[PDB]
Protein: Ferritin light chain
Amino acid sequence: SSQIRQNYSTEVEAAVNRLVNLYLRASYTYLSLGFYFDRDDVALEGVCHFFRELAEEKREGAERLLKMQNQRGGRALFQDLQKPSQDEWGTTLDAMKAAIVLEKSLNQALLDLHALGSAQADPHLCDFLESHFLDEEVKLIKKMGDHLTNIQRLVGSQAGLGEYLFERLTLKHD
Amino acid sequence: SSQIRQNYSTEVEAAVNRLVNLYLRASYTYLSLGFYFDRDDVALEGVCHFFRELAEEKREGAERLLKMQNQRGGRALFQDLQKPSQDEWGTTLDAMKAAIVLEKSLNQALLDLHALGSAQADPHLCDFLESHFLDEEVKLIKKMGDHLTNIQRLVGSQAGLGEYLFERLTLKHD
Amino acid sequence: SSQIRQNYSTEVEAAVNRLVNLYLRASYTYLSLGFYFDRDDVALEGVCHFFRELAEEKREGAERLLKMQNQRGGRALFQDLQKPSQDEWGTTLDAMKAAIVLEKSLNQALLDLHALGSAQADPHLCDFLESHFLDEEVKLIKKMGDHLTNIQRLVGSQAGLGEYLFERLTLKHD
Amino acid sequence: SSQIRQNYSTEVEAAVNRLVNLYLRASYTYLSLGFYFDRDDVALEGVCHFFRELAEEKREGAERLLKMQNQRGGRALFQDLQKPSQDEWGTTLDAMKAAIVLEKSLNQALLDLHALGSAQADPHLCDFLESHFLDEEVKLIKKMGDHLTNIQRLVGSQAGLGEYLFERLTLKHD
Ligand SMILES: [Cl-]
Ligand SMILES: [Cl-]
Ligand SMILES: [Cl-]
Ligand SMILES: [Cl-]
Structure:
């Protein structure tokens, strides 16, 4: 079973497993976003790359949670992973709006788990989230907000031009 | 007190202290401009960087004045530093117009102090301003005037597009 | 306005702006201390350098606070910056005593803001202060306390000798 | 005679020759100061080195004046060089006080010549002094004032100790 578990509540253990599911769901959403922007009828390489990188980052966050679960003596439990909310993601603007909604949901889940840890007097859990998740999420949401503002300023009366220019001049591409 | 002071009028000493205040005020104005352009709802990185660099340059000018005050045997006297004239700075165009107004005010203060030094037959003071301040200010005002012209040509009927393009293609960013 | 703000109270936002003012005030106090020790009638280079470095450190702390304010979606608001409490700072001992009073005031402000963040369940704020401010301040206050003890032991009946020796043999100079 | 002279008054030409004499006199004074501190019954190596370096600097200033005299088409005229004002120079404090008196006299001579050049509308002369002499002299007088303050603080009731320590810990020696 476990000979190591200490100060690790069943409530935190379950909440960590749920958060793993949320991060893997987010990773899957970003995989879908990335491949949508690689369609020949969409063809925005920088947008594709932005979301493919986020799919990897969310996968890695799930793996860090799972490592920690085992370090604490809890037990990973995996659930079905629901498919993303859309099959087609619209414009870069639509996609970036969906991404910031997703990230705020992950951030609230992190804050909720931190509050549970606080309540349970679990400082290792609280430290873990502070050190590896909370600032990473604030930084990412600030980046997305920056991007949304620039996308919005480029719409003008010439949406296609603006969408090309943002992809070319802000996002990273070959 | 001082055993070194020679040919250094009380009028120049006081005017140097006032100029220190003006440069520190200018530095504070540029700090505010820089952080405004870093807002997620403004998000013009090149504009942010332009003004953050000027905040550092004006700080350094104040420090050079203070070093000189002591080299001459005058006494630094610091006054309260008023907050910048605005909390929000509008568009890049509004900000660059405010910056050139600010720089012309600093330039007139430099010219006034040079004229006082001339009147007081203080060639070290006059040399000091010629060598470290007057051309730096002319160069900067020419740069700002160049930028204003380019910003103005980009307004068109598509202001957001123009403001993005200027930030991307003229100003230095990551 | 902001599309990123999440779990960031108006109370914390205002307190961060106040703390910016306190750090910029502290920076200004250290600028004045530094230039006082550069006077030809004071002439303690190591003391000058010690306080000029602190002016830069406090400026940088204010800039880190302002970056964080924007990362969280709050709005920087700048106030007038009061001049330092003295125009002349006495002996190295007087100056180091004033510095530790100043640092304890900054430390209490940090602790107060941490307590507000705790109360508001704002773990990103609390982490931010823990990671970038609290230990830096404890380290600095310990250094100043060390210096005060050494300065005090050197007073003897030969104050000028002691003040020279401390500057020469403890503080960093050319 | 000269085929190059232009805008170079006889008054400036004569004043340049006088200034050469003053600089060579100063160099000779510093040679004497240096060798006094090398006496086995004085034996303050750092003090010796300080004044020997100034003897070289004043020689070089005279040579720069003579080069300029020829560049302008004036004619060098050399006069007898009076011996220094003392044969023995007392303590480091006495010597540093004599040095700052000497430097203020050179500085006033520079300022007087600058004023003559101004009056004669001789901008090359004025530039020459600004570029190669005025700031060098302000810097040196500030250094000497710094040293005087430190020497004075070290007198205490233990003059010999203070004089040793200043030589050892402020002045450059082997
Ligand atoms: Cl589903
Ligand atoms: Cl005001
Ligand atoms: Cl005040
Ligand atoms: Cl004689």
Observations:
- The pocket of chloride ion (ligand 4) is lined by residues D 82-83 (CB under 6 Å).
- Chain C has one domain: 10-170.
- Helices of chain C lie at 10-37, 45-72, 92-119, 123-153, 159-169.
